[PDB]
From a paper:
CD1a is a monomorphic antigen-presenting molecule on dendritic cells that presents lipids to αβ T cells. Here we use CD1a tetramers to show that CD1a is a ligand for Vδ1+ γδ T cells. The crystal structures of three Vγ4Vδ1 TCR-CD1a-lipid complexes reveal that the γδ TCR binds at the extreme far side and parallel to the long axis of the β-sheet floor of CD1a’s antigen-binding cleft. Here, the γδ TCR co-recognises the CD1a heavy chain and β2 microglobulin in a manner that is distinct from all other previously observed γδ TCR docking modalities.
To understand the molecular basis underpinning γδ TCR recognition of CD1a, we determined the crystal structure of the CO3 γδ TCR alone at 2.0 Å and in complex with CD1a-endo, CD1a-sulfatide and CD1a-DDM to a resolution of 3.2 Å, 2.7 Å and 3.0 Å, respectively. Here, to crystallise these ternary structures, we engineered a hybrid TCR fusing the variable CO3γ domain to the constant TCR β domain and the variable CO3δ domain to the constant TCR α domain, as done previously. The comparison between CD1a-bound and CO3 γδ TCR binary structures indicated minor conformational changes within the Vγ4 domain of the CO3 γδ TCR. The most notable conformational change corresponded to the hypervariable 4 (HV4) region, which is thought to bind butyrophilin-like 3 protein and remained solvent exposed in the CD1a-CO3 γδ TCR complex. Transient transfection of the CO3 (Vγ4 Vδ1) and CO22 (Vγ2 Vδ1) γδ TCRs into HEK293T cells demonstrated that both γδ TCRs bound to CD1a-endo tetramer, but not to CD1b-endo, CD1c-endo, or CD1d-endo tetramers. Of note, the BC14.1 Vγ chain, which did not support CD1a-endo staining, differs only in 3 amino acids from the CO3 Vγ chain, while the DP10.7 Vγ chain differs by only 2 amino acids, suggesting that tyrosine at position 104 (Tyr104) within the CDR3γ loop is essential for CD1a-endo recognition. Accordingly, both γ and δ CO3 TCR chains are required for CD1a-endo binding and Tyr104 is apparently essential.
Numbering used by the authors:
A (entry chain C): 8 to 30, 33 to 248
B (entry chain D): 2 to 194
Amino acid sequence: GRTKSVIRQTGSSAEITCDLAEGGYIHWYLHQEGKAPQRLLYYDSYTSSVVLESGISPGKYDTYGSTRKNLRMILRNLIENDSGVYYCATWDGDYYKKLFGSGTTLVVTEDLKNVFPPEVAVFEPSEAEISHTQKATLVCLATGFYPDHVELSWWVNGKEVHSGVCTDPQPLKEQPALNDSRYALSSRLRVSATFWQNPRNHFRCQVQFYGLSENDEWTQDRAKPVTQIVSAEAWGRAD
Amino acid sequence: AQKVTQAQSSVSMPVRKAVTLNCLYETSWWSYYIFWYKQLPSKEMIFLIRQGSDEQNAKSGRYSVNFKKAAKSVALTISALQLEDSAKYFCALGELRWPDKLIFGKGTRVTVEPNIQNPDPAVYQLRDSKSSDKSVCLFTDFDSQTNVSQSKDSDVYITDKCVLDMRSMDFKSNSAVAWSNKSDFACANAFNN
């Protein structure tokens, strides 16, 4: 369960945590697709003071009510327009630059029944590529997932690999007219022909999906699309 | 009023080359700073370089700013491009006396493309490891100037291209994947070659 991915239904609340240490002001920025990052508010737990940016109703972002804790970032009455990446930020002590924390990605959907985990399939290299190039490209396809909160990795003989791999920079919409469309994502792993031809070598494509939690309820005829890992694997073959 | 505008939406440039990312701003502040950040797909916002309104052109490694104050123009040049320079670059404006918020532009995506010195364009068909009746098409080893055609069909999906780096072999290659759930799918006509 990753704190960087949050999925909520319209009308609920979501708490976003700040990974930066507070001494100074803590600023919160919202970054939506294709738009400029915008500060929403900033606060100081030491003075217990909160400054909202202009155009924001005071009931949208709650900061108090924490059982003896620092000021929090809790978004109330979520709508789809709250979807985006949220960053906390603070100025360096020498005020040289402003430091941003890791972004938390929030998706607010009209119905949690729109949430699906990926199906994963691994496609074995073409013999034509092996014979022509002495290399072997495996392809991993993750399909039918929503939201687009996945991390795809390749594992060879039990160890994650970091070379000979590339994954599409952006998932594509399988039904781009639906708005709530499920997504697809592909990835390649390329090895030498002789490594793929060894039957002892084990290849696994792993897709970490960030989905529903244990607090979530949901009600639909299928397995609860919780945060999970779905994989597909293939072994080497000499023929 | 404070405004920041990055008119370029997306740029592509080969490795080892340079790219200049433009930024035009409006400000009533007498002294200020321009900041450039690099935004990664992991959702990280990484500081690169700062330009002061009274300072000479800033320089930091492969990053340099061409600051034209009278034009309120503040272009970032990235030299000797690497594949890892692919990111979305943000220009931001901040006030110096009481450092407060940053006003951002919308960002400019940079895609760095490999120099395929010996292209070998080819389309291959790959079978599912568990089904064999399911398949995908792989377009690979083409040069970076190749324009991967987009799908002209609802039931046919074509990915963008990505570059992989076989680091133990000093070898990089482009590829794109096509697939469909229809028996009438030919890899040849998939990428419209």
